[PDB]
Amino acid sequence: RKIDPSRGATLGDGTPNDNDRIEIGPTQLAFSEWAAAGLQLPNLDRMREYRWKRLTQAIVDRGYGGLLMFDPLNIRYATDSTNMQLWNTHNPFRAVLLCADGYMVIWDYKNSPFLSKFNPLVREQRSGADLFYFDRGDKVDVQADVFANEVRVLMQDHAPGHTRLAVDKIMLHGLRALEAQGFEIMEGEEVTEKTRAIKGPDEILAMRCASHACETAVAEMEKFARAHVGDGKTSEDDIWAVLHAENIKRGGEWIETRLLASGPRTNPWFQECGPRITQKNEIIAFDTDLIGSYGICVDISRTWWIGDQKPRPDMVYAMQHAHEHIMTNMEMLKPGVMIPDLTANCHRLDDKFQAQKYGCLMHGVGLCNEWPLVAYPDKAVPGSYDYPLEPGMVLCVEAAVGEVGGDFSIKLEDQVLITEDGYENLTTYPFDAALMGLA
Amino acid sequence: RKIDPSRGATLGDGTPNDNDRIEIGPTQLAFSEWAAAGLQLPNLDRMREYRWKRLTQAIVDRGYGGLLMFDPLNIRYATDSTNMQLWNTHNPFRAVLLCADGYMVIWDYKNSPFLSKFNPLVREQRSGADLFYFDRGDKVDVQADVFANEVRVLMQDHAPGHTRLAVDKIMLHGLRALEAQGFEIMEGEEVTEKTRAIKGPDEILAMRCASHACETAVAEMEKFARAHVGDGKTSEDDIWAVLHAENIKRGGEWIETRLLASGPRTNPWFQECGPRITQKNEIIAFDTDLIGSYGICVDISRTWWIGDQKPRPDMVYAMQHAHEHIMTNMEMLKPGVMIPDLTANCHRLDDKFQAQKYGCLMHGVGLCNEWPLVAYPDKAVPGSYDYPLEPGMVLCVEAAVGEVGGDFSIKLEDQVLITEDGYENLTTYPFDAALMGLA
Ligand SMILES: [Fe+3]
Ligand SMILES: [Fe+3]
Ligand SMILES: [Fe+3]
Ligand SMILES: [Fe+3]
């Protein structure tokens, strides 16, 4: 019945050593690689408790009575329970209520109430929070009233006297039913984003594991790419598919974008991974945007030169410039620095790269891309992110470098932890030596 | 430079024969398999025109002035343009406005206005519809008002006199800003679900292609499973990873669920694909829930026996019962049948299988799971889906068969087109011979 014969009743992360358990997670492949790498495993119970305590405190601090979550990523933060995450993202069938006294209720898919029972912090498993046309047709409104009354009763019993209810995102039928029950609806994302921005110690351990699994997956992809780019039939999709499979093999969950592109399709950036047949002596650039092991997002970007010739000198300069961009901007990071000061003091890209530079120079990361967004000075809005960095924040540091009308771009990105007195770059993946001008 | 040297200026679906184009789509591998299989390809231009005309007409019929879409799946329907779909599903950065005169505008990611330029029906590419805390922090409200005013001006110019604006789903700041501009917000999903439910000729062609690619990919996964299950290390995730890769290799897009499970993890159903090490002489059941080539959803389910020994007799019976369930229910399908009569006349499962039967016996499908939902008699809600089937609808037909406390379940499902005179089962994938009671 054990999935790992070499261990006792529990796995290294404290979960049941049971091949037949309901709960999923990292595979034996991932665990094996992490152990060989000397990575400490998170304790999931302590992690779940940390997140829950923190989210409750956030509600209390704002003087709210509760927080109601329909975003699958917020539900994942609150409960660590998944259920058809990707379907859930555009079908709001699921909901979690967390009250000011810490009492937490989930409304799950009717047929699957068992999916969150591994987490005892989830005190109740209900159903009927699915308020959208596919699931209920012309009778959404009736159930919206049933649900909103349930939320009223829960709030009466667990947040008496509170009328402020924070909601991340809710269908209009739901919004109106809640307001009909006398709730003042507050901005749920302001609560969830600032809570999720600070990782506890187990989250950081989990993230270290996911990063390692991601870098392993990327290394398989680079091996495949260098092995058969230019063979006349290997597509962008063929290469990218390796990342998909190696992620899933290690217990990863999905990939957020299609940001892999070859040759002239790298400029302008944001062209999507497709059928293009790759060529010898061309750039390939990509962004992992990966929801990986333990559901942790690993967001890094690399640019490869593949071929028998040397890359052009303008390619080497661009690569070196981008690398300088993220290493300079990274060095600004430490606790107490104000986010708009990052914007104001950031490394200056050459004029010819300014037009097509990235949408931010940094952003938060956790279970996916997260607050804060650190804009370049010409896009930054005063009063949008007037907050200081704190230990436990994790920021991805970005560079997109390419000219208007040019035939290539560089994309680089590392994932960086804020520590007690500075920063630690979590990303160890190599930079292409030819593009760096070192080979 | 051509991606397919055997063709002229265009590919079989009318798109440019250009290896370097922005637009993505099916790979040469997919096109090659479809040509081998005898499949007529969709014409994408005609398909895009059919959807747009139909969506515009839907607005006109209801007496609305416009329809505003933040669901990436509805955006896909209206424009056929993708952009970080999965990120978009839980980060509403994107919007499409379609007015009563057919005028259509997209607000896209700031850095990527070019992604919808291939569709001349999209008349403008703007930015600034991203109304959520990650993207704008404490200054969502300012841009919400800028966006809402833009919508007002467009509606004044292209739907003068109309104050009814259908919206599928929008963040509260956006909702408030639009209402402040005088709009009465109508249920957008009621419009999009009913429009999307009838597929044009080209959408049916695209779906035939997607179905074949999906079945091909599943064939690879079956090969992998039968060759490796029970080798002491092959996990659920290992098997499932094959479907991911093979889908991506054919220009597919993502998978909506984690519904693949082995052995006792199939009962109860909806346990998720994970690290479980698979065993010889065991059931593996799965649900593709796949967003495939041309962005079309293929939603089929099969159950497999892998082992030396024979399946148990109760397994074989359950499989037969399940297969009987869907084939009987499928026979109800033809134009003019009222959905609640599908419910009332459905095949009855044995008492022992009733408690855990699926959440529906049928549902629509197109770009993903869509309206209608056909519930079993004990869950159906009167007045929820009082509409007749029509030619061009596509419905998946479902069976979940398992006992309370049982150690396996059967899951079967086929994807069926409604024709002028009846139905056409689009799904050709075989049923497990041993489970069916053959040899
Ligand atoms: Fe990214
Ligand atoms: Fe990033
Ligand atoms: Fe399904
Ligand atoms: Fe289905």
Per-residue CA distances from B420 to B55, B178, B333, B423 (Å): 22, 42, 11, 8
User: CB B249 to CB A237 under 8 A?
Assistant: yes
Beta bridge partners of B285: B261, B303
Residues 6 or more apart whose CB falls under 8 angstroms from that of A73 comprise A367, A368, B90
Give chain A's length: 439
Separation of first and last alpha carbons in chain B: 51
CB pairs under 8 A between A and B: 270
User: CB B110 to CB A269 under 8 A?
Assistant: no
Between B72-79 and B188-196, two packed helices, what is the crossing angle to 10 degrees? 50
Structure tokens given for B80: 């056929």
Residues 6 or more apart whose CB falls under 8 angstroms from that of A61 comprise none
Q: Which of A24, A277, A373 minimises the CB distance to B275?
A: A24
Chain A contacts of B358, Cβ < 8 Å? 111
The rounded Å distance from CA A406 to ligand 4 centre is: 45
Which of B18, B175, B258, B266 to probe by mutation at the A interface, max A CB count within 10 Å? B258
User: CB B275 to CB A386 under 8 A?
Assistant: no
Determination technique for this entry? X-ray
Give chain B's length: 439
User: CB A369 to CB B138 under 8 A?
Assistant: no
* Strands A66-69 and A362-365, bridge-based pairing: unpaired
Nearest CA to B83 out of B72, B74, B97 is that of B72
Nearest CA to B294 out of B244, B251, B248 is that of B251
Residues 6 or more apart whose CB falls under 8 angstroms from that of B158 comprise B66, B99, B100, B101, B103
Chain A contacts of B111, Cβ < 8 Å? 268-270, 356, 358-359
Q: Which residue of B has its CA nearest to A190?
A: B133
Structure tokens given for A47: 């992690």
SS3 A285: strand
Tokens 């509760």 — which residue?
Answer: A66
SS3 A417: strand
The rounded Å distance from CA B252 to ligand 4 centre is: 18
The rounded Å distance from CA A248 to ligand 2 centre is: 20
Q: Which residue of A has its CA nearest to B185?
A: A172
Closest chain A C-alpha to B71 CA, distance in angstroms? 7
Tokens 């008492």 — which residue?
Answer: B351
Q: Which residue of A has its CA nearest to B273?
A: A24
CA distance B315 to B303: 10
Structure tokens given for A14: 């404290």
Residues 6 or more apart whose CB falls under 8 angstroms from that of B295 comprise B76, B80, B82, B253, B367
User: CB A90 to CB B83 under 8 A?
Assistant: no
- Please check whether residue A41 is in contact with residue A22, taking contact to mean a CB–CB distance below 8 angstroms: no
Neighbours of B138 (CB within 10 A): 15
CA distance B172 to B178: 10
Residues 6 or more apart whose CB falls under 8 angstroms from that of A197 comprise A364, A366, A370, A371, A372, A390, A393
Nearest CA to B397 out of B382, B418, B378 is that of B418
User: CB A273 to CB B373 under 8 A?
Assistant: no
CA distance A317 to A149: 62
Q: Which long-range contacts (CB under 8 A, 24 or more apart) does A51-57 make?
A: A51/A77, A51/A78, A51/A80, A51/A200, A51/A203, A52/A78, A52/A98, A52/A102, A52/A104, A52/A121, A53/A102, A54/A195, A54/A198, A54/A200, A55/A98, A55/A191, A55/A192, A55/A195, A56/A98, A56/A100, A56/A101, A56/A102
User: CB A28 to CB B233 under 8 A?
Assistant: yes
The rounded Å distance from CA B198 to ligand 3 centre is: 20
Sheet of A290-291, strands arranged across? A254-255, A290-291, A297-298
How would you write B382-412 as a 3-class SS string? Answer: CCCCCCECCCCCEEEEEEEECCCCCCCCEEE
Burial zone of B287 (CB within 10 Å; 0-12 exposed, 13-18 middle, 19+ buried): buried
Give the type of residue at B13. D
- Please check whether residue A393 is in contact with residue A364, taking contact to mean a CB–CB distance below 8 angstroms: yes
- Please check whether residue A128 is in contact with residue A109, taking contact to mean a CB–CB distance below 8 angstroms: no
In CATH terms, are B1-199 and B200-439 the same topology? no
Tokens 């967001």 — which residue?
Answer: A299
CA distance B58 to B50: 12
Nearest CA to B108 out of B159, B69, B166, B164 is that of B69
CA distance B336 to B390: 6
Residues A177-213 as b/e (b if ≥16 CB within 10 A, e otherwise) read: bbeebebebbbbbbbbbbbbbbbbebbbbbbbbbbbb
Chain A contacts of B268, Cβ < 8 Å? 111-112, 114
Dump the DSSP string for A121-165: T--EEE-----SHHHHGGGHHHHHHHHHHHHHHHHHHHSTT--EE
User: CB A137 to CB B384 under 8 A?
Assistant: yes
Give the type of residue at A107. W
Nearest CA to A347 out of A366, A365, A327 is that of A327
Chain B contacts of A72, Cβ < 8 Å? 90
* Strands A104-107 and A95-99, bridge-based pairing: antiparallel
Q: What stretches of A292-437 adopt beta strand conformation (E)?
A: 297-298, 301-306, 362-365, 369-374, 394-401, 410-418, 423-425
Q: Which of B26, B72, B111 minimises the CB distance to A269?
A: B111
Residues A94-118 as b/e (b if ≥16 CB within 10 A, e otherwise) read: bbbbbbbebbbbbbbbebbbebbeb
Q: Which of B90, B172, B275 minimises the CB distance to A25?
A: B275
Nearest CA to A168 out of A95, A85, A88, A80 is that of A95
- What kind and span of H or E run contains B52? helix B44-62
Nearest CA to B211 out of B86, B43, B30 is that of B30
CA atoms within 13 A on the CB side of A33: 20
Q: Which of B189, B235, B274 minimises the CB distance to A133?
A: B189
Chain B contacts of A132, Cβ < 8 Å? 189
B257 DSSP assignment:
-
SS3 B277: strand
B114 DSSP assignment:
G
> H-type helices in A289-349, by residue range?
313-331, 339-345
Between B28-37 and B201-228, two packed helices, what is the crossing angle to 10 degrees? 100
The rounded Å distance from CA B303 to ligand 4 centre is: 14
CATH superfamily, region B200-439: Creatinase/methionine aminopeptidase superfamily (3.90.230.10)
Tokens 């006109």 — which residue?
Answer: B60
Q: Per-domain residue ranges for chain A?
A: 1-199, 200-439
- What kind and span of H or E run contains B31? helix B28-37
CATH, domain range B1-199: 3.40.350.10
Chain B contacts of A235, Cβ < 8 Å? 27-29, 249
CA distance A21 to B261: 11
CA distance A159 to A154: 8
CA distance A260 to A276: 11
Query: What is the separation of C-alpha B37 from the centre of its chain, rounded to a whole number of angstroms?
Result: 23
CA distance B55 to A164: 39
> Which ligand places an atom closest to the C-alpha of A397?
2
Q: Computed from CA positions of residues A416, A418, A422, A424, in that sequence, does the dihedral angle turn out positive or negative?
A: negative
Burial zone of B65 (CB within 10 Å; 0-12 exposed, 13-18 middle, 19+ buried): buried
User: CB A91 to CB B241 under 8 A?
Assistant: no
Structure tokens given for B360: 């529906």
Resolution to one decimal, Å: 2.1
- Please check whether residue B48 is in contact with residue B201, taking contact to mean a CB–CB distance below 8 angstroms: no
Structure tokens given for B251: 């220009």
* Strands A104-107 and A124-126, bridge-based pairing: parallel
SS3 A273: coil
Residue A187 backbone dihedrals phi, psi, to 5 degrees: -75, 105
Structure tokens given for A300: 């890094």
Residue A268, preceding peptide bond in cis (omega within 30° of 0): yes
Per-residue CA distances from B160 to A51, B157, B178, B181 (Å): 50, 6, 16, 14
Closest chain B C-alpha to A221 CA, distance in angstroms? 12
- Please check whether residue B283 is in contact with residue B330, taking contact to mean a CB–CB distance below 8 angstroms: no
Which of A127, A242, A272, A409 to probe by mutation at the B interface, max B CB count within 10 Å? A272
B183 DSSP assignment:
P
Separation of first and last alpha carbons in chain A: 52
Q: Which residue of A has its CA nearest to B111?
A: A359
Which of B1, B4, B20 to probe by mutation at the A interface, max A CB count within 10 Å? B20
Chain B contacts of A171, Cβ < 8 Å? 169
Beta bridge partners of B287: B301
Q: Computed from CA positions of residues A165, A166, A170, A176, in that sequence, does the dihedral angle turn out positive or negative?
A: positive
Residue ranges with CB less than 5 Å from ion ligand 2 = A 299, 396
Cα B210-B212-B213 angle, rounded to 5 deg: 65
The rounded Å distance from CA B41 to ligand 3 centre is: 25
CA distance A131 to A177: 11
- Please check whether residue A121 is in contact with residue A79, taking contact to mean a CB–CB distance below 8 angstroms: yes
- Please check whether residue B324 is in contact with residue B286, taking contact to mean a CB–CB distance below 8 angstroms: no
Nearest CA to B261 out of B241, B280, B248, B278 is that of B278
Residues 6 or more apart whose CB falls under 8 angstroms from that of A401 comprise A318, A319, A321, A322, A325, A349, A353, A357, A409, A410, A411
